[PDB]
């Protein structure tokens, strides 16, 4: 029914990356919303979004951005909810700028940061799932199945 | 008073950093355990710790390591719980080796990674608190009070005197 | 004597760096204000400071921050004024995290970024002065005199004695 | 009429990047000149250009270069005008060489530095606009409109 | 007959790199096994593999992985055999993450690390060969021939 | 008691690092020699050392160097023996120049590279030991005992007192 | 007639880069030889080449290599002649490994290092030319002409 | 005794590094001059110094600078002489900014670049000596003697005592 995870990203160009988070949440049947919120171009949209997230029923926010990537950290500044950050791969610096601007948060306002790129987007959704599983037993069983299938499906030898 | 968070680290030299996570959980009245588990010197200890964490009642694991920092990632391989990683600052490469070896987990096994050093340890505890707050209303109120106080405590101007 | 430049920083620990901007504006007789505004601990304070800056008569904002340094960029998001950013040197990564998180603004919202540390703070004040000089002839003459003196003051040879 | 911003770049290969600065100034109707000036191959051209910029009526210089990128800093050495620097993306090091050789100016001679690549070129033009807006009210209103349109135009959700 | 070197890699995507190790061992007629073992997705498979390697008759393990690359180091944690590590080139960070997560092992558990990418995979196989040559004289002669041919085959001038 | 491992380094300043390899080989009762060989100042000494190593009875070479660190790679060019490289930490670039100039050998001439600094020197000796253990059963038993003791010696919890 | 500059490179794959040095020397009519010499695969060829260079009449050596790039430094170890180093762009690390392994020579054995890639190869040839011009007046005049033409040929404005 | 090499640097703070070039030229009896020329604070001084160097009888220029290090490159823009660049170590970025801003000259205007710091300064003087030796037989013999002595002076083993 109502969303319990919010996926937000700074622009349409981030979607090629953040779609992997959206797909994973859908696979695990976690109700969620998927939105564009720009820290730099729509800062008041971000303030309102982050400030009202908990009262709207959201439990986790997944935020993706690239370059001087401020969206996850500023989201965390306005909410007590856990915020997970996805560094989007940038053209010149390959997401090293994205990674350092997200992960290096000063003490007092955390962002749980995942890998650069599609791997990070997928893992932010899995981390959000593991958080919700702590108090949602049906989901916890679906997550167990997901992790079991991942493990069991790894081949024993490479194909030529 | 059974532990609901586990703080683990590879060596005593990590404690100077990880003590900041311990202090913050205690401040917020979150029961927890603090242990040494070496990914490289005690790999079977790690396997056992991680695979039994959920049945022992743990809800979050905070793992710190430096250099080729494998403890958070291998912990996450064996548990379904959320694992949070603290890159401990290293001597030569200033924690850049720690950071990359923790945060760059391939898709499928997450570690939620915090800043290099003491800031990251403090933030791993706050992030764990924000997770537990989702289903613990008393802790949720303590955390809001804590965040509100942090905000109200920021000075308006610097002390500019010579 | 109303302020025409605003110097802002996230914490008292930034003052050791940002004091160099303050000193240079005073030397050039540019009225200014100096404040602590934390992007992460006081985000509503930042929104209010930045959105009202122009109507309060400010012409330039100089913002310093370190680590995941978001203060200059978020200030620029809310003001139409020019924002100049000073990367404060950080402990582990020597200001490389500060530099990249300030200078790499996506197209649409600029921050004019200066060098890591004290040199950058001094240069943010000089750059602000060069901006204001475009429409303040008395300050323009003070700035030319200052630049001329800097040039004339460079020694011709090093002191080479043992 | 007469130019009030000068866009200079070290070579024709920089134009793919610096054209974004030229386009933005034209969009905001800021009269400007767009020139090739090489710090390394035409150093006397650079000295003359920078030394006479103010007396020619220029108010801001935008300078782009790549690699060991000296054009912005040497321009600033010869003028009291504000100089804004655009690090052009280099082939091997992806503009990290460009960025460090522009931004790390010693105290006493500033260059306001923007992002590596096309984003930086666009933002140098916007920063030049915000500088001129301080004493040109018609332009200040056009810049307000530009920033308002940027903010209002951000979509609320990504397209698949 | 029975394998004396084990080549292991974290996923099928590593094979484009690790095939160069497999080819070299085959060229030198060193019996070996070539397997997928994931540190993160199949950690119990890894524990069993590394713990039993010596008793199965393996003498050297070559382990390849990318990103947060833990496979070589965790393999070394469970075996007294020499473990050689190949950093696989990652998409964003070009194997710098792979290299630092493999080479920077703390004192007490070594991994002999080779270059990022195909060069490293080839050299891990050559290093494994030089190790086995110490107590296998027929192989030592084949390795001498291999190195002699490499040296003799280098042209004296480039082709246009 | 003839040497079966050769430890070589470019200068006396490398000894503070390479002494950790020497100590570990002695602990495990592995006879060895320790020498200064400069790739850049004594290139003919290096050629002779490396090309005669196998006929002199050496089985493994451990080579340390810093900066533009060419000693391990050029040693490997002249010997068929396994060569293990230790990146010595450098002043400005913290051993990153040492690391890249040793580990990034093009295909055809291997150097097995260990961590920057003292950890790498210790691990080069342990790796050499694991190589020799493959055909020396007494040493194999000493090495297993050593690794077992390392594992059993890891404490279960940190010393957390103030 | 007889060569006065030697261009050497570690492999055929370096030629795409080092051909720019060869072309420049030919343009300035500087007699030279262009050879493959591998530090790692033909170390005795390198020793002989560098040791006999001066007595063969060579005045400058230009040496190019990539990755763990040892060719320039080891050449300098065996000759009193000036050795100029060209870092060849490597696949993963984009010549940062090449650059640091060439430029960071300890005191006592120098290598004059140029930029990563084709720019460096061209500039090594120009630097070799400026060295020879010091005692060859006809060449000094040709180099003056070359530099004058470079300066005069820079356009004043970019082409669209 | 007219100078045939010019050593130039941007500030007195560079002398701690550039003094190593001065000492080595004096040791090899190469007459030279040592001056401060700031690319950014005295750009016309630099233009004049560089464009007149050859007619004044200089054969090689050794230029040191740190940070955004433009002095060697701009010197080379104005002279046809060989210019050798010394990256002076910087506080935050350890000379990596100095190194990249000197070595990465686009094709057409060379700077022969040496190592970061004192080693680079010493090697710039040795490289200048090797250039001048090509047409100065007495200096050629002094340089060979110097290189031979360096080689013969390398010890055969480290001092390994505790």
Tell me the DSSP string of E78-133: H-SS-EEEEEEPPTTTTTHHHHHHHH-PPTTS--EE--SSHHHHHHHHHHHHHHHH
The residues after which chain H has a C–N gap greater than 2.5 Å are: none
Q: Which of D153, D113, D142 is nearest to D25 (CA)?
A: D142
Collect all residues of chain B within an 8 Å Cβ-Cβ radius of residue E41: 77, 108-109
Distance CA D56, CA H12 (A): 36
Distance CA A65, CA A11 (A): 8
Angstrom distances, CA of residue H115 to CA of F91, H17, H85, H99, H150:
12, 11, 9, 8, 19
Q: Which two tokens stand for residue H31?
A: 């007459």
Residue H71: exposure state from Cβ atoms within 10 A (0-12, 13-18, ≥19)? buried
Determine whether the interchain pair A119/B106 forms a contact, defined as Cβ–Cβ distance below 8 Å.
yes
Closest to H70 (Cβ–Cβ): which among D10, D70, D78?
D70
Q: At residue F108, what are phi and psi to the nearest 5 degrees?
A: 120, -30
Own/partner long-range contacts of G150-153 (Cβ < 8 Å, ≥24 apart): G150/D41, G150/H108, G151/D41, G151/D42
SS3 A144: helix
CA dihedral A72, A73, A74, A80 (to 10 degrees): 90
| Cα radius of gyration rounded to whole Å, chain E | 16
Q: Which of H56, H42, H45 is nearest to H6 (CA)?
A: H56
Collect all residues of chain E within an 8 Å Cβ-Cβ radius of residue B90: 104
Nearest chain C residue (CA) to H34? C157
Q: Which two tokens stand for residue C18?
A: 């940002």
Angstrom distances, CA of residue E38 to CA of A82, A125, B57, E33, E45:
29, 21, 27, 16, 8
Beta-carbon contacts of residue G103 (< 8 Å; ≥ 6 apart): F68, G85, G87, G111, G113, H99, H103, H113, H114, H115
Q: Contact at 8 Å (CB) between E54 and E75?
A: no
Which letter, b or e, does each residue of D44-77 get, where b requires 16 or more Cβ atoms within 10 Å of its Cβ? ebbbebbeebbeeebbbbbbbbbbbbbbbbbbbb
Q: Contact at 8 Å (CB) between D67 and D41?
A: no
Q: Contact at 8 Å (CB) between E15 and E48?
A: no
Name the minimum distance, in Å, from the CA of D88 to any CA of chain C: 13
* Beta-carbon count within 10 A of B64 CB: 30
Residue F53 CB-half CA count within 13 A: 31
Q: Contact at 8 Å (CB) between C96 and H93?
A: yes
Q: How many helices (H) and strands (E) does chain H have?
A: 6, 5
Closest to E151 (Cβ–Cβ): which among G18, G41, G67?
G41
DSSP state of G150: H
Distance CA H44, CA D86 (A): 24
G112 near H CB under 8 A: yes
Determine whether the interchain pair A104/C96 forms a contact, defined as Cβ–Cβ distance below 8 Å.
no
Distance CA E136, CA E105 (A): 30
User: Which residues are F65's β-sheet partners?
Assistant: F87
- The residue assigned the tokens 């706050």 is B126
Distance CA B7, CA F134 (A): 39
Closest to D108 (Cβ–Cβ): which among C130, C133, C150?
C150
Collect all residues of chain F within an 8 Å Cβ-Cβ radius of residue H119: 67
* Beta-carbon count within 10 A of B159 CB: 8
Q: Which two tokens stand for residue E113?
A: 């690390």
Determine whether the interchain pair A40/C109 forms a contact, defined as Cβ–Cβ distance below 8 Å.
yes
Q: Contact at 8 Å (CB) between F55 and F128?
A: no
Q: Contact at 8 Å (CB) between A11 and A37?
A: no
Collect all residues of chain D within an 8 Å Cβ-Cβ radius of residue G117: 91-92
Q: Contact at 8 Å (CB) between E68 and A115?
A: yes
SS3 B26: helix
Backbone dihedral region for residue D67 (phi beyond 0: left; psi -120 to 50: alpha; all else: beta): left
Q: Contact at 8 Å (CB) between A53 and A60?
A: no
Angstrom distances, CA of residue C147 to CA of B19, B35, H96:
51, 60, 28
User: Which residues are E113's β-sheet partners?
Assistant: E85, F113
Distance CA B71, CA E17 (A): 26
Name the H residues in 21-60 with CB < 8 Å from any G CB: 59
Q: Contact at 8 Å (CB) between B92 and F94?
A: yes
Distance CA A119, CA A86 (A): 9
C94 near H CB under 8 A: yes
Distance CA H158, CA E30 (A): 39
User: Which residues are A65's β-sheet partners?
Assistant: A87
Determine whether the interchain pair D114/C112 forms a contact, defined as Cβ–Cβ distance below 8 Å.
yes
Nearest chain B residue (CA) to C19? B160
Determine whether the interchain pair G154/D94 forms a contact, defined as Cβ–Cβ distance below 8 Å.
no
Angstrom distances, CA of residue B150 to CA of A108, B23, B145, B157:
8, 16, 9, 16
Whether C and E touch (3+ CB pairs < 8 Å), yes or no: no
Collect all residues of chain B within an 8 Å Cβ-Cβ radius of residue E69: 101
- How many residues are there in chain E? 160
Residue G64: its H or E element: strand G60-66
Q: Contact at 8 Å (CB) between E25 and E129?
A: yes
Distance CA D67, CA D10 (A): 11
SS3 D152: helix
Q: Which of H153, H141, H104 is nearest to H29 (CA)?
A: H141
* Beta-carbon count within 10 A of H92 CB: 22
User: Which residues are G113's β-sheet partners?
Assistant: G85, H113
Distance CA A100, CA A110 (A): 14
Distance CA E51, CA A141 (A): 31
Residue D138: exposure state from Cβ atoms within 10 A (0-12, 13-18, ≥19)? exposed
Beta-carbon contacts of residue D35 (< 8 Å; ≥ 6 apart): D6, D7, D8, D9, D49, G156, G157, G158
Name the minimum distance, in Å, from the CA of B50 to any CA of chain A: 14
CA dihedral G135, G138, G144, G149 (to 10 degrees): -150
Measured in angstroms, the resolution is 1.8
SS3 G120: helix
Question: What is the side-by-side strand order in the sheet with C112-113?
Answer: C32-36, C5-9, C60-66, C83-88, C112-113, D112-113, D83-88, D60-66, D5-9, D32-36
If you write DSSP's letter for every residue of G9-33 in order, what string do you get? Answer: ESSGGGHHHHHHHHHHHHHTT--EE
What is the dihedral sign for C-alpha B117, B118, B119, B125?
positive
Determine whether the interchain pair B116/A133 forms a contact, defined as Cβ–Cβ distance below 8 Å.
no
SS3 H46: helix
Question: Quick one: CATH architecture of B1-162?
Answer: 3-Layer(aba) Sandwich (3.40)
Beta-carbon contacts of residue B119 (< 8 Å; ≥ 6 apart): A104, A105, A106, A107, C67
Q: Contact at 8 Å (CB) between E98 and B101?
A: no
| Cα radius of gyration rounded to whole Å, chain F | 16
CA dihedral C102, C105, C111, C115 (to 10 degrees): 40
Distance CA E66, CA B153 (A): 44
Q: Contact at 8 Å (CB) between H73 and D68?
A: yes
Name the minimum distance, in Å, from the CA of B160 to any CA of chain F: 34
Q: Contact at 8 Å (CB) between H68 and D104?
A: yes
What is the dihedral sign for C-alpha C11, C12, C17, C18?
positive
H116 near F CB under 8 A: yes
Distance CA D65, CA D75 (A): 12
Determine whether the interchain pair A80/B147 forms a contact, defined as Cβ–Cβ distance below 8 Å.
yes
Strands (E), chain B: 5-9, 32-36, 60-65, 83-87, 112-113
Q: At residue D86, what are phi and psi to the nearest 5 degrees?
A: -115, 110
Q: Contact at 8 Å (CB) between H82 and H111?
A: no
Distance CA F68, CA F77 (A): 17
Collect all residues of chain F within an 8 Å Cβ-Cβ radius of residue B14: 158
Determine whether the interchain pair H154/F22 forms a contact, defined as Cβ–Cβ distance below 8 Å.
no
- How many residues are there in chain G? 160
Q: Contact at 8 Å (CB) between E30 and E139?
A: yes
* Beta-carbon count within 10 A of D23 CB: 13
- How many CB pairs below 8 Å do chains E and G form together? 45
Residue C84: its H or E element: strand C83-88
Determine whether the interchain pair A154/E42 forms a contact, defined as Cβ–Cβ distance below 8 Å.
yes
- How many residues are there in chain D? 160
Distance CA A120, CA A103 (A): 13
DSSP state of D81: S
Distance CA F124, CA F83 (A): 10
Q: Which of F33, F31, F20, F28 is nearest to F115 (CA)?
A: F20
Q: Contact at 8 Å (CB) between C119 and C64?
A: no
Name the minimum distance, in Å, from the CA of G147 to any CA of chain D: 8
Question: What is the side-by-side strand order in the sheet with E5-9?
Answer: E32-36, E5-9, E60-66, E83-88, E112-113, F112-113, F83-88, F60-66, F5-9, F32-36
Q: Contact at 8 Å (CB) between B80 and A144?
A: yes
What is the dihedral sign for C-alpha H113, H115, H119, H121?
positive
Residue F23: its H or E element: helix F15-27
Q: What sections of E5-65 are H helices per DSSP?
A: 15-27, 43-52
Which letter, b or e, does each residue of A75-100 get, where b requires 16 or more Cβ atoms within 10 Å of its Cβ? bbbbbbbbbbbbbbbbbbbbbbbbbb
Collect all residues of chain B within an 8 Å Cβ-Cβ radius of residue C38: 154
Q: How many helices (H) and strands (E) does chain F have?
A: 6, 5
Closest to E158 (Cβ–Cβ): which among G9, G45, G68?
G9
Determine whether the interchain pair E104/B68 forms a contact, defined as Cβ–Cβ distance below 8 Å.
yes
- Range D1-160 classified under CATH 2.40.160.40: no
- The residue assigned the tokens 């669209």 is G160
Q: Contact at 8 Å (CB) between F54 and E133?
A: no
- How many CB pairs below 8 Å do chains A and D form together? 45
Q: Which two tokens stand for residue G84?
A: 């100029």
Closest to H74 (Cβ–Cβ): which among D66, D74, D105?
D74
Q: What sections of B28-95 are H helices per DSSP?
A: 43-52, 71-78
- The residue assigned the tokens 């343009």 is G27
Mutate to test the interface with B, among C67, C92, C93, C94 (most CBs of B within 10 A): C92
Name the minimum distance, in Å, from the CA of H133 to any CA of chain D: 29
Bridge pairing between strands G112-113 and G83-88: parallel
Would you give the end-to-end CA distance of chain H in angstroms? 50
User: Which residues are C34's β-sheet partners?
Assistant: C7
Beta-carbon contacts of residue H11 (< 8 Å; ≥ 6 apart): H36, H38
Q: At residue H102, what are phi and psi to the nearest 5 degrees?
A: -100, -50
Residue G62: its H or E element: strand G60-66
DSSP state of A61: E
If you write DSSP's letter for every residue of C5-36 in order, what string do you get? Answer: EEEEESSGGGHHHHHHHHHHHHHTT--EEEEE
SS3 H86: strand
Q: Which of A72, A94, A11 is nearest to C74 (CA)?
A: A72
Distance CA E68, CA F99 (A): 18
Distance CA D110, CA C112 (A): 10
Determine whether the interchain pair D77/H40 forms a contact, defined as Cβ–Cβ distance below 8 Å.
yes
Distance CA F81, CA F86 (A): 16
Determine whether the interchain pair C160/H92 forms a contact, defined as Cβ–Cβ distance below 8 Å.
no
Q: Which of D54, D9, D51, D4 is nearest to D32 (CA)?
A: D4
Determine whether the interchain pair F74/G39 forms a contact, defined as Cβ–Cβ distance below 8 Å.
yes
Name the minimum distance, in Å, from the CA of E80 to any CA of chain A: 23
Backbone dihedral region for residue G108 (phi beyond 0: left; psi -120 to 50: alpha; all else: beta): left
Nearest chain H residue (CA) to G108? H123
Nearest chain D residue (CA) to H98? D101
Beta-carbon contacts of residue D47 (< 8 Å; ≥ 6 apart): D78, H43, H44, H47
Q: Contact at 8 Å (CB) between D93 and C78?
A: no
SS3 A20: helix
If you write DSSP's letter for every residue of D83-145 in order, what string do you get? Answer: EEEEEEPPTTTTTHHHHHHHH-PPTTS--EE--SSHHHHHHHHHHHHHHHHTT-HHHHHHHHH
Distance CA A17, CA C142 (A): 52
Would you give the end-to-end CA distance of chain D in angstroms? 45
Determine whether the interchain pair F122/E131 forms a contact, defined as Cβ–Cβ distance below 8 Å.
no
Residue G35: exposure state from Cβ atoms within 10 A (0-12, 13-18, ≥19)? middle
Beta-carbon contacts of residue A48 (< 8 Å; ≥ 6 apart): none
If you write DSSP's letter for every residue of F60-120 in order, what string do you get? Answer: EEEEEEESS--HHHHHHHH-SS-EEEEEEPPTTTTTHHHHHHHHTPPTTS--EE--SSHHH
DSSP state of E12: G
SS3 D74: helix
A133 near B CB under 8 A: yes
SS3 G148: helix
């Amino acid at each position: 029914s109502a969303p319990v995870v919010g996926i937000i990203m700074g622009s349409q160009s981030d979607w090629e990356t953040m779609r992997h988070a959206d797909a994973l949440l859908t696979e695990l049947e976690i109700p969620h919303e998927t939105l564009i919120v720009s820290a730099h171009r729509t800062p008041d949209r971000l303030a309102d979004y982050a400030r009202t997230a908990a009262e709207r029923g959201l439990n986790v926010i997944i935020a993706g951005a690239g370059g001087a990537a401020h969206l996850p950290g500023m989201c965390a500044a306005w909410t007590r909810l856990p915020v997970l950050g996805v560094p989007v791969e940038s053209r010149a610096l390959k997401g090293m700028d994205s990674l350092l601007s997200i992960v290096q948060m000063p003490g007092g306002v955390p962002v749980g940061t995942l890998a650069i790129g599609a791997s990070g987007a997928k893992n932010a959704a899995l981390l959000a799932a593991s958080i919700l599983a702590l108090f949602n037993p049906a989901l916890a069983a679906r997550l167990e199945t997901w992790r079991a299938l991942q493990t069991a499906s790894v081949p024993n030898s490479p194909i030529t």
